[PDB]
Design a binder for this molecule. Structure first.
Ligand SMILES: CC(C)(COP(=O)(O)OP(=O)(O)OC[C@H]1O[C@@H](n2cnc3c(N)ncnc32)[C@H](O)[C@@H]1OP(=O)(O)O)[C@@H](O)C(=O)NCCC(=O)NCCS
Lengths: 380, 380
């Protein structure tokens, strides 16, 4: 059996976001108005404070005043609302991923018939057949596409899809994996409550977006353009982090429980989490590496930056994504990678990874699970 | 980078089921009593006829008369019931898998510390952290265990976990994958209705169970005992099968809709689906192969048997699993593999695959997706 020789390589990155732009400056005005919570004046000041410090400037949402008016239960706190949230999500998640996938396939330059695998991740509702099937059908991929559907994996899923794609691409000759992460906040949209302060954080951070990539080993020279090589993939459940990030798909929708200790737990353990991939590549200085860190919140980026002694330009690509699109869960880290290669091509840098050789793709979510990938950039 | 040489090998199989046995003969009496539908006499006769022709003799359930009385909403048709269904499923799914995993690890003979990967599949509710995290924690596996959580993939998931485990084991040296499939019917439990005849099928067929396997390449001689080798893994979405098995996770739980003839569609296309792996091994006669077909119902086993001209003993292991435990979704096909292996050992057959060299693991579900794996048995 002939197995491919080279590491799993990202051959194309494409992104998409819904067209309805919501400025973070005035998001509390919209948020408290659609959920009929204008009377909760003290809670609005608290949400304004969180939004002002969120590092987010704008977010793209599928949900509008019109869609929330047509589905009033989504605007209610504890009322049965899973059915209309799912009906929106099940349709929009693969549709958004379709636009991201088309852009990734167009950038790749090869026909869609060469796609042998499909890895899809979403935390925006569940359905049978899954979003993976829906995407495959919408794009017109081969009916024999090998699918890996990753439902409800949260914010580390951007890293999980690349970890899964690594093994699929590297173990199958000629395998070209379509990776897709798509998040639509229809299921997580929570009305503000004085009893759910961690729900205000999620409401200030979560945005919509989709990212798609083509991953494959042994790139065909003068045909495919290698962007990043995946050299190591792994994860870690952080000690004493039980219940730090919980998410339950209830009748009222997807309820997130975020403890305030999340940025601190990641900072305390980030050096230990990065220990194994660092030794694989002979301990390069943190400041000699590129960083595609999931913008879970600004406090996570600020505290990883401070704990590791990183120069302020390292977290810039992550902060730019957070500023322009917010926390798009699984999609976020792939948008960061796209921004890293785009900045590199725009500035005519030595490599696709901001001039640096090695880099990290870090995602975090439920567990607390921190998913890490060691990437090598390509010389340009 | 040193990659392993051999194919992904099943090194141990362990199974588990809840202790409450419900005989199929009198199941309609229990079912119509807990759901308060004793007055629906004509529907009871129709359900009795489905249970009598189901090929199922007994099913193991976590749900009892006691648990259903303490959770009245689960016994209702359209009343909001996802919350108590989830509370039960989220706790019981990894607990059942723990028991199956312990049995698999014990049969393997190596410490649990050597497990580098965990692939979990379930259609019995969703949660963040997933059932994968919960299983890893309950077993005390390394905090760095690489996880693949397969939620809501239905009845093909038993084959998907093996396809995923194939690439993980074959692309990583020393990798030992814990495969786990666990199904508890708390979410699929549907009160009988004259307006949901598709629900009667699921009510007559779905049972509880868990199966766990240890998958790895390059077995260390005189330490590990190879049971089956995975040589090919793939899938296919059957033509003109749109909406054949639709499953929606609603407020009232998991609702199934069967818009097409599932057993008829698989039979018509099975020759075409099996074409690629048969080609890999020079088209051996179907009757010279072992069959680990998912016991979705009696019709699928009967119709594949008739279309492919199989001798009656081929579907026996699948029929024995259906008879003893019903349709345990993802877990079923792995129980069949265990039964094929067990029959082979007790009858002192030449191979672990009932004397035959090559064989198929066929899973089917939403799409209509048919997942197939080509396995080679081990000489004993
Ligand atoms: C939420 C966040 C943007 C707030 O900005 P900040 O720079 O931390 O500013 P502060 O911490 O001083 O203020 C945050 C306010 O929200 C509260 N808050 C922050 N995180 C909270 C949480 N997880 N649960 C409840 N309240 C929280 C703080 O207590 C404070 O409330 P206050 O008005 O009574 O003082 C920041 O803490 C952050 O990014 N946190 C991580 C968010 C996260 O975990 N994201 C991943 C989600 S999967």
């Amino acid at each position: 059996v002939i197995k491919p020789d080279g590491p799993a390589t990202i051959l194309a990155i494409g992104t998409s976001n819904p067209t309805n732009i919501f400025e973070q400056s005035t998001y509390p005005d919209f948020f408290f108005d659609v959920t009929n919570c204008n009377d909760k004046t003290e809670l609005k000041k608290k949400f304004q404070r969180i939004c002002d410090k969120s590092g987010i400037k704008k977010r793209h949402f599928h949900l509008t005043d019109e869609i929330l008016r047509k589905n009033p239960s989504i605007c209610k706190f504890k009322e049965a609302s899973l059915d209309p949230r799912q009906d929106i999500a099940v349709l929009e998640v693969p549709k958004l991923a379709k636009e991201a996938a088309i852009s990734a396939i167009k950038q790749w330059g090869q026909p869609k018939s060469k796609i042998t695998h499909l890895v899809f991740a979403t935390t925006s509702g569940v359905d049978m057949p899954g979003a993976d099937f829906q995407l495959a059908k919408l794009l017109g991929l081969r009916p024999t596409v090998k699918r890996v559907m990753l439902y409800q994996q949260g914010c580390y899923a951007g890293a999980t899809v690349l970890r899964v794609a690594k093994d699929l691409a590297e173990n199958n000759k000629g395998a070209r994996v379509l990776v897709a992460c798509s998040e639509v906040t229809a299921v997580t949209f929570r009305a503000p409550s004085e009893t759910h302060l961690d729900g205000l954080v999620g409401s200030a951070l979560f945005g919509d977006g989709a990212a798609a990539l083509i991953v494959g080993s042994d790139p065909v020279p003068q045909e495919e353009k290698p962007l990043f090589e995946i050299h190591w993939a792994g994860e870690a459940v952080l000690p004493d982090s039980d219940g730090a990030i919980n998410g339950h798909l209830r009748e009222a929708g997807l309820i997130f429980h975020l403890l305030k200790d999340v940025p601190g737990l990641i900072s305390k353990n980030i050096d230990k989490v990065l220990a194994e991939p660092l030794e694989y590549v002979h301990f390069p200085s943190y400041n000699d590496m590129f960083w595609a860190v999931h913008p879970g919140g600004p406090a996570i980026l600020d505290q990883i930056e401070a704990k590791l002694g990183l120069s302020t330009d390292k977290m810039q690509a992550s902060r730019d994504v957070l500023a322009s699109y917010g926390n798009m869960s699984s999609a976020s880290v792939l948008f960061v990678l796209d921004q890293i290669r785009k900045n590199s091509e725009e500035l005519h840098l030595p490599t696709t990874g901001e001039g640096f050789e090695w880099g990290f793709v870090i995602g975090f979510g439920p567990g607390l699970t921190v998913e890490t990938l060691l990437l090598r950039s390509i010389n340009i």
